[PDB]
Symmetry: D2
Subunit: 461 residues, 4 copies
């Protein structure tokens, strides 16, 4: 006999699957009882979560609004059309000049779909080098020639780099490399670059060598929506993005593309190629709950409160970096123009691994990161998540104080036990000074609110 | 200006933050329970799955996998993913020493493409079931004009195999002959609109004869596989991929199963590391951890005795439906079904699937037009999973058969009165009292059954 | 001190390099003291040899007439232009409808240059299967998927086959495969097919699936020039050829291509692509001595004597095959329409290797060859070379008698020593019956003239 | 009709069978000895080479190689090819245990492409000397507009390296940097218009640093390499390819040298089988055995003491020529030469190579325009091999320098009188008594020297 629908299908998670329910409750507590400084993370709204967890997951709607493969899409079409128009509005795009596809499962599929749309297999691509702050999906191969990224497997990638002494993108070397290599596509945007991007200069390079210009704005898209950084839309042909980082939405991807007349009576040709690449070439039915949740996030992204948030994210990153530099610490480029700071630890004789591990033991989550394109010598620290919990400059200065204490302990351990990781680990065991800072972190962390769920009804307090 | 308080933007419910979207979801909830949903690639998943899907797990970015993450804070995500992996093996009765699984694919299409990336080089040869024969886009597709449509046919070299044009069964002899000529590195089995079970043993003999890897995409039947109601692809295939929302009744997600341990030179399987590396770092970023959580929930449900009875009932409902249709004189491809769907050939009626799909759509009966016998699409594909999840049994699917009978009867009457051109046919859809009577009988029939995933008593629109 | 020009540069070979001179003299004797039945071999004229061995080898002339990269080409241009116009005339082509490039080093580079001209890497190609009588450059991969031919390495090949019971090309299976595989290019022509080609049917297939149609006529080009077989030019877009087989010229290649209006006011687009593929994409400076020698061969190919020769080649192959069949032997397709016969030995319980080896010991040169597309079960026998020495039907009937004797001995050895090759070899050692037939072969062979050199002044007699 | 007797079509000499072609060859023979031939990729080979080239060896089709032929009758072809191979190793002082060679490439361009096919997969990365910097098409070439011109850039992925734009020497630091960025699987050295020796040791350090194979195309200097007059590529390269008709003075043919034996894991080199298989069956058919015979002859000549003195003289002549030009105020790229050629930069004169090439061509002085400093071509390339083969020594090349001096002096005068547009420049070439006087002085100078390959006393046209 089948289970009644009420038994299997309407009973809440806490009863159907206590194991998973309990783990989710623990992850909820982890998220609000520490200091989350991963620049690729945020805390989204309950409203987004409610649309994400909804009956929209049940609808399979291959195709797009007005050109579907089956019926019953009267409401899924409206949700997607709303999501698309809200996406153009969030980034201040004229609909006759820009279109957007909101079906990519995530930012990385969005990139590969864009490539598939406008390139043939083995076409040449250039993107920011991983040690310089770029992303895997912009191309990555090892010194041994092992192709790591699919972008480097199915296309021919060549990375460009930051200047090794200033940490800024070396635009002259960019242009020289693009004239030698002749990429069909240049990617800009990155994961760990602490400055704004000169899209105008990327456009001059792309025109000089004949390339398409794509910006992957996954990391700064929220700042782009609030017009707090340079807009890639002013100079790029295509803009891709993940939607959960500084944009504060669900996990999802978008591809924006130029429409209308080119600046021969020529018109852009991207719309149909982009749509076709997403479906039917790469994806099946879109994840409609993601599209609903995204539409919610894009409306929230259009509000004066979100512009104030993006402003605060920048101000918090600046205040944290100033606090660190005021303690003698070295930031790559000596500051920031966006949501993150990149902390160079080689002046301290430390590696990013050591600091990341010790911070993680105090519930301060950062990530080790390569520096000046040259074990990784730094850590990357992001302001979006904690700003979303309402922290302002004074709070980030206190975060800077916790980081200051954390690196001081990391140096105390390295001096007492050794410079090799095997040595360093010896000092983490039952370290009373780590325990103290972990307590101070948790106390501080628990003084702020938390979007996405009510701290008052969580299982673990 | 100042920042919104967290309570305002971050804790306020959807109905207040975004009434527009809230209202559209409420309307979609009503649409899902006011009609008869017969799309074979759709199901209604559980509220428990949905609760895990809509959770703070969305906030955690955990590039890598348990034990080899790129950053910390992963203590609970690792446990959830490990549980998802172990429950995936349990649900399909797999020995952890012989099988591994990766649960990070965003969906079934990325699961396929990551599997290809793992075991093939660009332009390696692939064979899969032809689309007119019931196959899927991600198994390879190019048009008679030579346009490469599927990315699988863009980055690899595909060649389809077909069903026998008279019996509708997979032509295993032509499959073997094509494979020996083309020499694929990878043969794919599994499909979208095939109404019979698969002879994996025979696929394995072909693969071994031509030196190919053998992958099954069980997206459509994976629920029936978990319940051991259809043949197991795992008995013969190197790799098995799946989507998790169709007959498996889970969230939107994908998995890749791969063999491990000794090959039956003392050589052992080499899939595990290649598969994992292809999913990440090669193709994806951080996994969608809320999907992994929701999938872990669905996989525990799929291991329950109730789910096994559900799978039996899906098959029984599809059989009882096909038998009711053939009792009315209708033609099914292969004359029946061994799985969750029936493929109805309308060409003997002088109809196209489009016309039947449109009139059904107007009575809130959702089917999809579909090519038949590999040869405008001349059929409709009808699936049993979703309505079986609302508790319908054989008698209910016979009444569904009667609604389909009435629907196609009206379709013929319209075609006869107005003509075969769609412009003509449309005329018979306007103020049609017999469509209204069917629409009403459908909605009344539909409202007799429960609905998983949300509470009907709380719906905005009843 | 440098050698005087007279010493190193004008002294004849016999004095500069006695080793090589002596070996060439031995090869000359080998060529006229046996029976040469390799269908891919001929004996060219002394006139061709004189142009081949000439000061034309010294001129490097990259480009083509009227569009060269350096000076001094006043006479090389005239030679090449003459070679091209003589090539169109030899095959009865209108210059407004056909062009030809005569720079390919050989037939195989001619094929790859044609492919490069009209295909992109990994485009699909179909050609006659090697076991069915096709050529390596039409595509070849092993059962294990090892890509053997460059055509199968840089493009995607799929072979079509002869009917396994009739030995004729299976045109229905050809069309079905072309509709499944959708090649961009279909190749016709082959190495060991004993019948004419239905180019009209290949054209219907290519049109139905949208492919270009190329004929590689290397083997029958001489018969094509004499209009003794079907002309590929009537239905193919491109025709390639080697120039030394039945055409009786030097070692070289040619690519013919359609010009002018298509049968949208559309015109063919092959000329510039073909020329560019040959140079600068693939070759350097052409081998001008080859082009001079080829022009000589093409004039000879246009003469009534050459038409009589091509007629005689066919009549000799027919007479030889009739003689063999009259002894109970089995030919694939039961006869021939061209220069060769394909002898099926499986009815005798023999392999082609065994017969080839024993014939080679009697100075009868054939080659083992696969049969009905299914160790190779047959031998391929060609009439061009011995016909060029003036042999007619009665002489080829006597060749058939020598072959009859040779296979009889091969069966006597297989019966006395065993069916395995290790066994069979035991019977070749100091076999008096082989010795006798070798003497009869040589006596017969030495009764006929020899083009290319004067038998009367050769070193070895 | 009947067949022509063998005596008529087959034994009659060319002058009777084809008077047209016979006459054109006689005219080309005269052209070759009535002027000054300064094309660096041309030579005059020996009558012995020509005798072997024009022989019955053309008739033998011998697919495969000695010891592994596809059919019989190969007893003497095998011996000739083995001798050609052993003499190829002897001429370049190679130990048969450390080096093998394949002598079947139809020419140097097929030798290169077969080598690539042997050691690379389609689309593997290759680096070679940029064409404006003195490189060759087969080392990779694509235009600023992105059009892939060389097949090497069509089937593989190429990236050129360049000379230093101010010194004209290979920029080894940028080479290393580009190689570490691009990560080629194959780095090519050797070139067409580079006037200095190559630092193979440095190429080897770069190759080792980036994990590349290292191939030298010594087509231009192979004669000087045989005579140990320039650096040996064999000391540092995995593979060495060459054409055989330039400084080596042989027939038109190609060879591929490859390392064998232990790598300096007890691993050994793996090139031999791959190279052979790439030449045949992969890319070519039967070898051109008359070329192999003629090449065996040239390789015995290249091992003679006279050939070593010839190579010394080529270098001395090119030096004496460049010194004479620079003494007249002219500019050479790098200020001199270490090999067989000089690269004359005409941009300081306000001239293009085209104008100088055309006026020289009108005085029966054959040079070729050529790009310079990697930046209309602003130079001419002048080679010493061919005229050195006619016995010219330093004094003769100084007189050639004087003819070039007079030629470019006239070129400037024409440009000054008529203008810089080629339409203008052409006007000064008509009934020019000073061009005639130079043409006459050139032909008179030219007729003082012998000519290899044929007898001047037998020429149709004296």
């Amino acid at each position: 006999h089948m289970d009644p629908v009420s038994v299997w299908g309407n009973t809440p998670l806490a009863t159907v699957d206590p194991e998973i329910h309990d783990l989710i409750e623990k992850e909820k507590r982890r998220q609000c009882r520490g200091i989350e400084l991963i620049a690729s993370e945020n805390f989204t709204s309950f409203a987004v979560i409610e649309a994400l967890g909804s009956a929209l997951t049940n609808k399979y709607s291959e195709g797009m609004p007005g050109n579907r493969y089956y019926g019953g899409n009267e409401y899924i079409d409206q949700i997607e059309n709303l999501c698309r128009s809200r996406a153009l509005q969030a980034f201040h795009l004229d609909a006759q000049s820009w279109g957007v596809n909101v079906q990519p499962y995530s930012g990385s599929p969005a990139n590969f779909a864009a490539y598939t749309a406008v390139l043939n297999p083995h076409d040449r691509i250039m993107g920011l080098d991983l040690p310089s702050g770029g992303h895997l999906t912009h191309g990555y191969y090892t010194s041994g020639g092992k192709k790591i990224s699919a972008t480097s497997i199915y296309f021919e990638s060549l990375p460009y780099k930051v200047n090794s002494t200033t940490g800024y993108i070396d635009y002259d070397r960019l242009e020289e490399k693009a004239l030698d290599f002749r990429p069909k596509l240049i990617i800009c945007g990155g994961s760990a670059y602490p400055r704004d991007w000169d899209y105008k200069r990327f456009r001059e390079v792309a025109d000089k060598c004949g390339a398409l210009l794509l910006c992957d704005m996954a990391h700064t898209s929220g700042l782009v929506a609030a017009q707090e950084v340079n807009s890639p839309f002013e100079y790029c042909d295509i803009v891709t993005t993940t939607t959960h980082k500084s944009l504060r939405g669900p996990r999802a991807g978008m591809i924006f593309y130029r429409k209308g007349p080119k600046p021969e009576n020529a018109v852009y040709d991207f719309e149909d190629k982009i749509n076709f690449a997403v479906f039917p070439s790469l994806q099946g039915g879109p994840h409609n709950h993601q599209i609903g949740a995204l539409a919610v996030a894009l409306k929230q992204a259009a509000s004066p409160g979100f512009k104030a948030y993006a402003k605060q994210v920048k101000a918090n990153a600046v205040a944290l970096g100033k606090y660190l530099m005021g303690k003698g610490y070295s930031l790559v480029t000596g500051g920031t123009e966006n949501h993150l700071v990149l902390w160079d630890l080689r002046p301290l004789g430390l590696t990013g691994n050591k600091v990341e591990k010790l911070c993680d033991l105090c519930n301060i989550t950062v990530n080790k990161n390569a520096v000046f394109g040259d074990a990784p010598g730094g850590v990357r620290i992001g302001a979006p998540a904690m700003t979303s919990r309402g922290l302002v400059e004074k709070d980030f200065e206190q975060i800077g104080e916790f980081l200051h204490r954390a690196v001081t302990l990391t140096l105390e351990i390295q001096k007492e036990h050794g410079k090799l990781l095997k040595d360093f680990n010896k000092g983490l065991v039952n370290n009373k000074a780590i325990e103290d800072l972990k307590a101070d972190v948790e106390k501080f962390s628990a003084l702020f609110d938390m979007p996405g769920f009510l701290v008052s009804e969580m299982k673990y307090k």
